[PDB]
Amino acid sequence: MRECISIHVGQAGVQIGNACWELYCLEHGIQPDGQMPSDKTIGGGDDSFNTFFSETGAGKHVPRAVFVDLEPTVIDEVRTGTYRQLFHPEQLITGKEDAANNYARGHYTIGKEIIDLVLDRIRKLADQCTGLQGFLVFHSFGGGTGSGFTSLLMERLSVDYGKKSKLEFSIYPAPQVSTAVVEPYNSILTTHTTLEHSDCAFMVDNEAIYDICRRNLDIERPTYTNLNRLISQIVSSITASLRFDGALNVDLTEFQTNLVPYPRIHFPLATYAPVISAEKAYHEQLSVAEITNACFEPANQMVKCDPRHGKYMACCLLYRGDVVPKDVNAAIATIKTKRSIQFVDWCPTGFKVGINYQPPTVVPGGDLAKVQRAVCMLSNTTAIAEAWARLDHKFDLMYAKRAFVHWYVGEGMEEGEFSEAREDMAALEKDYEEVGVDSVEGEGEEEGEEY
Amino acid sequence: AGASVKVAVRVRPFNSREMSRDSKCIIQMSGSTTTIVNPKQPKETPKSFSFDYSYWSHTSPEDINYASQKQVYRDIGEEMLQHAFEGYNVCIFAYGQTGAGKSYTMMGKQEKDQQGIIPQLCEDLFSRINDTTNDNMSYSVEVSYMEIYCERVRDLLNPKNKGNLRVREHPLLGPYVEDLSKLAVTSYNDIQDLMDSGNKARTVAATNMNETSSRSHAVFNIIFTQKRHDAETNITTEKVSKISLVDLAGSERADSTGAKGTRLKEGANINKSLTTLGKVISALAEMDSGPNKNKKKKKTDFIPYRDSVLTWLLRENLGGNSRTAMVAALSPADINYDETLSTLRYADRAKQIRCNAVINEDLNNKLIRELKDEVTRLRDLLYAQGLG
Amino acid sequence: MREIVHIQAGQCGNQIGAKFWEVISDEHGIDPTGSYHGDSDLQLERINVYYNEATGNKYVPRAILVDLEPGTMDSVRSGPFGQIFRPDNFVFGQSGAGNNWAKGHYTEGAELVDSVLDVVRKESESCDCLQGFQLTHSLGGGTGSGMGTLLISKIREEYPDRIMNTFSVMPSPKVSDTVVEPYNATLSVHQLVENTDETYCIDNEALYDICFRTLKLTTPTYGDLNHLVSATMSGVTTCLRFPGQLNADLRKLAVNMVPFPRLHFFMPGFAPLTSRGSQQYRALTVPELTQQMFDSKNMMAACDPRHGRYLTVAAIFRGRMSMKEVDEQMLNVQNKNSSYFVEWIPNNVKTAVCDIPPRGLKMSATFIGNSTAIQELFKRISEQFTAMFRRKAFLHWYTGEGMDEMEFTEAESNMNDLVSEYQQYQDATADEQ
Ligand SMILES: CC(=O)O[C@H]1C(=O)[C@@]2(C)[C@H]([C@H](OC(=O)c3ccccc3)[C@]3(O)C[C@H](OC(=O)[C@H](O)[C@@H](NC(=O)c4ccccc4)c4ccccc4)C(C)=C1C3(C)C)[C@]1(OC(C)=O)CO[C@@H]1C[C@@H]2O
Ligand SMILES: Nc1nc2c(ncn2[C@@H]2O[C@H](COP(=O)(O)OP(=O)(O)OP(=O)(O)O)[C@@H](O)[C@H]2O)c(=O)[nH]1
Ligand SMILES: Nc1ncnc2c1ncn2[C@@H]1O[C@H](COP(=O)(O)OP(=O)(O)NP(=O)(O)O)[C@@H](O)[C@H]1O
Ligand SMILES: Nc1nc2c(ncn2[C@@H]2O[C@H](COP(=O)(O)OP(=O)(O)O)[C@@H](O)[C@H]2O)c(=O)[nH]1
Ligand SMILES: [Mg+2]
Fold first, then answer.
1. Which candidate in A55, A196, A254, A290 is catalytic?
2. Are strands B47-50 and B183-184 parallel, antiparallel or unpaired?
3. Rg (Cα) of chain A, in Å, rounded?
4. Burial class (CB in 10 A: 0-12, 13-18, 19+), C196
5. A271 among the known binding-site residues?
6. Which residue, A245, A268, A291, sits at the end of a domain?
7. Which sites bind GDP 2 (chain C) (predicted)?
8. Cβ contact, residue pair C247, A210, below 8 Å
9. Which residue, A288, B380, C51, C149, is most buried by CB atoms nearer than 10 A?
């Protein structure tokens, strides 16, 4: 019983959760109403897996989800939408104003009086669960409730549960594109919480997803639906190990063991190789070598950073479909023979491999092509610091003149929090710079035999 | 002329509760640098700051580098009284969270051997005058005392119904408050009595830290005026200056005090006022910098004075040909560590000078290095002289 | 559940409010009798934002109509949507202020303010979660400006933590319907700069220019001006009522657009705007909306943004659209006009998209801009003010009601200080020697 709890916070998290739960319902054959005609037609089975859905006596299946947001509108859409019967009636909506792109408002002022109700349901689910594997928290940087409320919730979860893995999926501000003025303040402020309490944080950038949609998928005008579907496919590939059989199955604990050399460098990038339209699905082989090579291309990265400017600390490939270990071994060797891909000398192995038989599913009305093979790559590298550096720059340009600070300090914070957050981020960047340094130049003291 | 800032940070001894408890000190200070260690992170690397004055009143019977009350007075208050006698405004800001030492700094104790800034200032003011009192030198001193709570002004001395007073801007005399009680004083005893009566009326609240905490900035204005009789038939006012003594409330965090409703509103207003004031004082010091650096720039810029009523009323004292000082209180107890750090972050303002790296080599390693260097030097001397 | 209380003071405020309520009733499909005769289900999903429910499935707007002259009240009640309003909310007196701010604020309004605040408090106590207020009025007039500022001060005293919005019509350079516009506008700005979270800045000049050069109306009237103001007033709060991909509350706009407390004067704008016969010659796309939004002539404040720099801007789009197009177009606007945007803000374009367009359009957009060029407007008033105050041109009427010259000096000084906090953050920075 490999059971995980999916928490969604903020508008971005809620829409991502909508896309993800559509994908899981399609994968497991559960209809929107919540029932399962597959078991009735066949006679029975384990397809109503405990990993995401809990079964009741009437044959209904409810997701192990906790949707949270301060705006009534975003989830009032869900209550009146197609999947109204899928979820529990409780949806944890504050009938009040939003956090207003204010970390202080979402953390100190309005985040209270809801954190209790939220934590109580996060229990009624954990107690119902047995052999809990971990939490998957979806949110976005730069938002009020997406920064403050997530910080408070992660703090309380660390206090209460502690040892359970807490994977984080989040959207970072882009270098050029933005949809709010105070994004750097919120993003820098929440850095302490996502550094201290989260066990592994997967980060995505909207500009990279837009570029992938434009180039690979030939979608000239993407919207949030396509990006959410891509992120949903990523999460499905991540969690497919603990649902379906496979030659090599990778649990969350093995992700933490392999992708986290030290506690404070738990910020890996992600990517999906066979992002390709139906028209371009032909004229291509989509072999294991091709997808493995495509995973490492700088253009296909989901965060606007260049891996060639840094060194790879660790990599983890999760293959789905008709894959046999000879081709993944050959592809790994081929990648190791390339010069552009630099690895840290202190990680000679440098690869984790997992294979699963279940191929990816296609969402009706989607844009991804049906394929026989796929791979999702996670990559802990030192290039991410570059992105952080850009963000840091923006913060100074807004903190030299104390602009937009009276809104934050009027809800409970002081300038000391800003200074502490900036210093913590600088320390994290320094650690990333240090760990990427080569090992001590061969300490060849040239001792001649006995001292 | 402009207006410079004298930043002084002082550390107090333990109290009965701290002495009875086995808490450790966390603030080291030397020269013009103050270092703080995290009790929870024994290896967090110490954090340093640097100010204009660094006062070690931690050890009461100390005789070496002890920050006596009279020493601090000679550093700040004597110079400010001299500047006031010259006919220019002088402002003294007090800062510190409850349990830090602000009240001691601004009032002192009753034995009169360790006096606060105000008692010494009043005594020297009355003395200097009683001496200069000739035939052509008339002097007048008046006192007012007000509070600022939630950006509304209130009179402390008057026992009338404590309503909100209006703030006006006289075209020549600048900002002022209407219907503010103004009284003349004759000796330091009258000033102390008026201060006690006003302080009994201050808005005080109970928090998770202490049952009595200040919820509102306060301003005790001393107005001093000199009339001269030259070798003529006319007696003319020479100059008028003001000695402003303010009790800025301390900053806080909602985590430290989780009270809802009125307490959160008061904390938000206090934080807004303190942020604005910090902006004004640092910006006013920016003038010094720029000016001295080049030699002329003209452009008066625009120093934000209207962003808060506290900075608006203190406009005349803060700006122009005047002087300002800032005394911050520090608590030595380990348990209050973060709060002390916060005060340091507030004490780092008004200049933000560079404290540089702070670290000391191990004494054993220092001895090893010195011994190795000495051995090398002596061996080189012996080999050069041919005796080794 | 967010919801707003609406107030309208003076003749201009009442006219714009009547047009605004007509527009909102059409948007939500509310009959003049108060019944609902719409089609879409989403219209009732957030009807409480502007209306209260009655017994017979009737919806009463949350309006509070105030004025010292009963003629405007009679005109409003004898109109297309006169019967929609609650009769008890028609608070009014007699013996109008007479284009005298002193009468509106100190002598005549001081008596009606008690009843007005009583009705406001009654409407506020029944609220589920009160977000903020909206006051429509004109500054250059009499009872409007005075009573509006007095009500603003009183409500901010009573409700400090609620958002405040004001849609003010100021004097203009050439068109000027009243002699004593400078004094009234100066005192009104003195109150507004202290007691308001957001102020929207409109004048008759820019509306006339929009009507003549863009809409090509031969004989525009006040109905069209109020129509444009209603369009932007609906666009500003569109996100409170209908769902969208990226929502924008009023507080979100306040946080993003107000870098410092005193700089909260905004220049509005609306797109698209076409002159009937030209409608078939244009393609409605996101680049076209952005181009018309950032066009200088489309601004409603009669201040050229090219004579200054944008501290912040906000784009509230409505309709089905692609987020990539919006982000790319705003980034292109920021990059191309690099010298017209303040440089110490890395990105100064707030964006939000609602999926429900207006009733008769496939797409629409509302532009808001906080820029330095607005100073110019204040400077103009200041000049006229001193031109009338040096000789005390029309001061005896004001002093007869109990005011003094020191208040005028205070107001002039406050406006002068505001003009500076806008230049400081303008002219590109530089080095010295
Ligand atoms: C039928 C058609 O395609 O023609 C259009 C039209 O020609 C144009 C020119 C319309 C037209 O507007 C004007 O001519 C006009 C004149 C003076 C002042 C303001 C507008 C139109 O009248 C206006 C009308 O607009 C609406 O229906 C909107 O929903 C609008 N409605 C009202 O304001 C309204 C009017 C009366 C009673 C109740 C509501 C709206 C806009 C924003 C928010 C809510 C509602 C439309 C579709 C048209 C005509 C009919 C010609 C425009 O209308 C707006 C501002 O939406 C003016 O530029 C736009 C763009 C349109 O292309
Ligand atoms: N990929 C993706 N990003 C989204 C989506 N919706 C919002 N975002 C991102 O969210 C950021 C804005 O912060 P949000 O998290 O949406 O703010 P919020 O969740 O509404 O919380 P509040 O700001 O307090 O109301 C933007 O930069 C968007 O890029 C979405 O549907 N898909
Ligand atoms: N230099 C010093 N020597 C001895 N005791 C000191 C010294 N400085 C401060 N104190 C002690 O500090 C206490 C009074 O100050 P304290 O009450 O801590 O400040 P506070 O009033 O709580 N802060 P605030 O309320 O914001 O003004 C007394 O116990 C004094 O003995
Ligand atoms: N947009 C618009 N402005 C108006 C209208 N009527 C008057 N005004 C403006 O309002 C100003 C006069 O203010 P007024 O309404 O008389 O103030 P009041 O008498 O106190 O209510 C003039 O300068 C006009 O420009 C109108 O119907 N529409
Ligand atoms: Mg939100």
1. A254
2. unpaired
3. 22
4. buried
5. no
6. A268
7. 11-12, 138, 141-144, 175, 177, 181, 204, 222, 226
8. no
9. C149
